Design a protein around this ligand. Structure first.
Ligand code: OLC
Ligand code: OLC
Ligand code: OLC
Ligand code: OLC
Ligand code: OLC
Ligand code: OLC
Ligand code: OLC
Ligand code: OLC
Ligand code: OLC
Ligand code: OLC
Ligand code: OLC
Ligand code: OLC
Ligand code: OLC
Ligand code: OLC
Ligand code: OLC
Ligand code: OLC
Ligand code: OLC
Ligand code: OLC
Ligand code: CL
Ligand code: CL
Ligand code: MN
Ligand code: MN
Length: 392
């Protein structure tokens, strides 16, 4: 199912870190963030998909051919920082799941992750098909587990209802709300989702274009709606499990399995870690593939795929060697990703409103306004958080 495959692709280790920590530390009060970020991602990914259908090119390619060279260089560098921050959460989340399963130190967990990710890149498309379905089964069923657990946990519905009213409770809640937006509105997909759509036309004609826009819109919203229900459920179960109970290391990903213990029993620790590992390995390989496509779109050339894989591993090993907490840096990476969202939105909103780019598929003037409002909101939230990190 198209809703199933995309919800699994969007459930990266960054979502696990932000949902568990969000519910455990702030209860249900951040449910409106997940709902809002999911609705924003619906509009943004629809524009990114409609850009590839109408133009036949991805967003990095259109920037390379239309904007002045120094601006293309700056946009390539910031998209490369998005690449490292995206891979940092996924590569480390897999290494963390290795520790949750085997007990190896985080350094060796990254070594095992590095060997698997290096080997996973050499595989062809026909060899990874059973693996893409395998990782999907693990992540999907864990998502359904939280959907069932959010009912069985009997959440305080008075607190659940109030959590959908936007309330930012200081700087700490703004830090985690920004991380949830970055974990939902993935800037790496903003550049990439155009490349998945480019060429999806069977044969060039306006009729086929409006057909694929119709199909993509239904599939994206259905998947996002499912991913949003799972994310809200995982945060709500984390709130019912830890919030207010003063549990040692609550919100951390090493104790997140306790959210599914009343449903899974002794299997909650293995099933959660296996899902965290599968979510980390698949998203780290896809992101590495996407980063290479993004560089070719911006610069017309790329570095060897093994070299890109080696460079993205360096921040993960350094964080491990520094003794930093894995769950905390996963959240930090999503916060940095949220600062890359407005940079990706500006060319997206500008290109999807041009006839020489979209042809007959120019975005409705209303949705262009909504897209700019989303950009101003995320800029304000990123500015609101970055303000209190300097004092205010
Ligand atoms: C591929 C799927 C199967 C997974 C197998 C990975 C394949 C590559 C393993 C390389 C060595 C990593 C194995 C662990 C490192 C060996 C040394 C070790 O175990 O060290 C433990 C000690 O506690 C530390 O001080
Ligand atoms: C917090 C902010 C609230 C967010 C509000 C949520 C609105 C729900 C929108 C869902 C998908 C929107 C799809 C928009 C598709 C626009 C396509 C268009 O305008 O036509 C162009 C042509 O069809 C091809 O490019
Ligand atoms: C935090 C976001 C990412 C941080 C990014 C920081 C670096 C910005 C990139 C290049 C410097 C400005 C462009 C100059 C280098 C591009 C070479 C070029 O094509 O143009 C040269 C000159 O600027 C023609 O006027
Ligand atoms: C197949 C996995 C085999 C796991 C490798 C051996 C497990 C060693 C162990 O004791 O488990 C780790 C610890 O329980 C962490 O929860
Ligand atoms: C916080 C708000 C987030 C939104 C909650 C999302 C879905 C609620 C329903 C989940 C859909 C799955 C149904 C669960 C179920 O049927 O469990 C029945 C149980 O076996 C006996 O009561
Ligand atoms: C058990 C599975 C639950 C799944 C979570 C969904 C809850 C419904 C949405 C939130 C509930 C709506 C508010 C309920 C409430 O009691 O709040 C009163 C509020 O003041 C009235 O406006
Ligand atoms: C299109 C049909 C209407 C959409 C159906 C939902 C009804 C609420 C309206 C918009 C949702 C977003 C706004 C809801 C949040 C209240 C307004 C707000 O943002 O302020 C926050 C809070 O009230 C400060 O204390
Ligand atoms: C491509 C990005 C565009 C570049 C443009 C701006 C870049 C700034 C990025 C991140 C600043 C935020 C750093 C967050 C560091 C906060 C450390 C922390 O742990 O915060 C704790 C929180 O206050 C309670 O838990
Ligand atoms: C992206 C799809 C996600 C699915 C969205 C499911 C939740 C819808 C909102 C419920 C708010 C109801 C509670 C509002 C009551 C306010 C109480 C004060
Ligand atoms: C808006 C979402 C659109 C996609 C919807 C797909 C629903 C897949 C999940 C079913 C959970 C049912 C739980 C099984 C019942 C437990 C008792
Ligand atoms: C068909 C295959 C289906 C079965 C496959 C999954 C079954 C998992 C079985 C044993 C869990 C091994 C872990 C030992 C018990 C863990 C329960 C627990 O309390 O967790 C402690 C935690 O590891 C401390 O941090
Ligand atoms: C394997 C045990 C780790 C110990 C340190 C290994 C040093 C090799 C460093 C980079 C090689 C990269 C190869 C690609
Ligand atoms: C991160 C700072 C710079 C890191 C860079 C130094 C690390 C090199 C060490 C081991 C990798 C060696 C991999 C060898 C792969 C062989 C592929 C080859 O033949 O190289 C030609 C070209 O790279 C493609 O065709
Ligand atoms: C701030 C609340 C969440 C953000 C949603 C704000 C939506 C504003 C625009 C709506 C449709 C535009 C109507 C005007 C269309 C002109 C053509
Ligand atoms: C400003 C900061 C103050 C906060 C208030 C936020 C206001 C947002 C509306 C801005 C949207 C303006 C751009 C949308 C109109 C547009 O460009 O559509 C026409 C298109 O270019 C031809 O097809
Ligand atoms: C704190 C609140 C934010 C503070 C920071 C302010 C940033 C505001 C960003 C966008 C405003 C609306 C911009 C709408 C631009 C529309 C441009 C357009 O439609 O086409 C013109 C294009 O430049 C032809 O090449
Ligand atoms: C890198 C991606 C993000 C770019 C980062 C841009 C940072 C600065 C932009 C906007 C400032 C944020 C404005 C926050 C809104 C609060 C300011 C305000 O209006 O104060 C309220 C009232 O005036 C007092 O009583
Ligand atoms: C100027 C931008 C935001 C301030 C305007 C809104 C003021 C609300 C946030 C101020 C605040 O709570 O800062 C406290 C400090 O960061 C520790 O608690
Ligand atoms: Cl242009
Ligand atoms: Cl409460
Ligand atoms: Mn994500
Ligand atoms: Mn930890």
């Amino acid at each position: 199912g198209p809703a199933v495959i995309a919800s699994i692709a969007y459930m990266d280790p960054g979502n696990f870190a932000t949902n568990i920590e969000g519910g455990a530390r702030y209860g249900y009060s951040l449910l409106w963030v997940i709902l809002a970020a999911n609705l924003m991602a619906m509009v943004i990914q629809n524009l990114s998909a409609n850009l590839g259908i109408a133009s036949g090119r991805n967003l990095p390619e259109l920037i390379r051919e239309r904007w002045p060279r120094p601006l293309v260089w700056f946009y390539w560098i910031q998209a490369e920082l998005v690449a490292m921050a995206t891979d940092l959460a996924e590569f480390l989340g897999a290494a963390l799941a290795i520790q949750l399963l085997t007990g190896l130190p985080m350094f060796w967990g990254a070594v095992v992750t590095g060997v698997v990710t290096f080997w996973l890149l050499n595989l062809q498309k026909r060899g990874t098909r059973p693996l893409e379905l395998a990782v999907g089964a693990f992540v999907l069923m864990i998502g359904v587990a939280y959907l069932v657990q959010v009912v069985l946990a009997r959440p305080d519905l008075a607190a659940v209802g109030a959590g959908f009213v936007p309330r930012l409770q200081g700087p700490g809640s703004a830090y985690l709300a920004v991380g949830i937006i970055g974990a939902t509105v993935a800037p790496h997909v903003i550049y990439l989702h155009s490349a998945l759509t480019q060429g999806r036309i069977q044969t060039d004609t306006t009729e086929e274009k409006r057909r694929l826009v119709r199909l993509n819109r239904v599939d994206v919203i259905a998947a996002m709606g499912l991913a949003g229900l799972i994310n809200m459920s995982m945060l709500a179960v984390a709130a019912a499990t830890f919030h207010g109970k003063n549990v040692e290391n609550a919100g951390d990903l090493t104790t997140a399995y306790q959210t599914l213990t009343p449903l899974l029993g002794p299997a909650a620790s293995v099933l959660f870690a296996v899902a965290l590992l599968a979510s980390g390995l698949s998203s780290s390989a896809v992101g590495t593939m996407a980063g290479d496509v993004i560089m070719q779109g911006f610069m017309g050339f790329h570095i060897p795929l093994w070299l890109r894989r080696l460079i993205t591993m360096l921040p993960a090993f350094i964080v491990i060697l520094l003794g930093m907490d894995p769950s905390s840096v996963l959240i930090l990476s999503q916060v940095i990703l949220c600062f890359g969202v407005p940079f990706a939105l500006v060319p997206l909103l500008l290109f999807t409103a041009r006839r020489d780019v979209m042809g007959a598929l120019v975005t409705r003037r209303s949705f262009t306004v909504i897209g700019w409002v989303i950009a101003v909101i995320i800029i304000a939230l990123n500015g609101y958080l970055l303000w209190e990190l300097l004092g205010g």
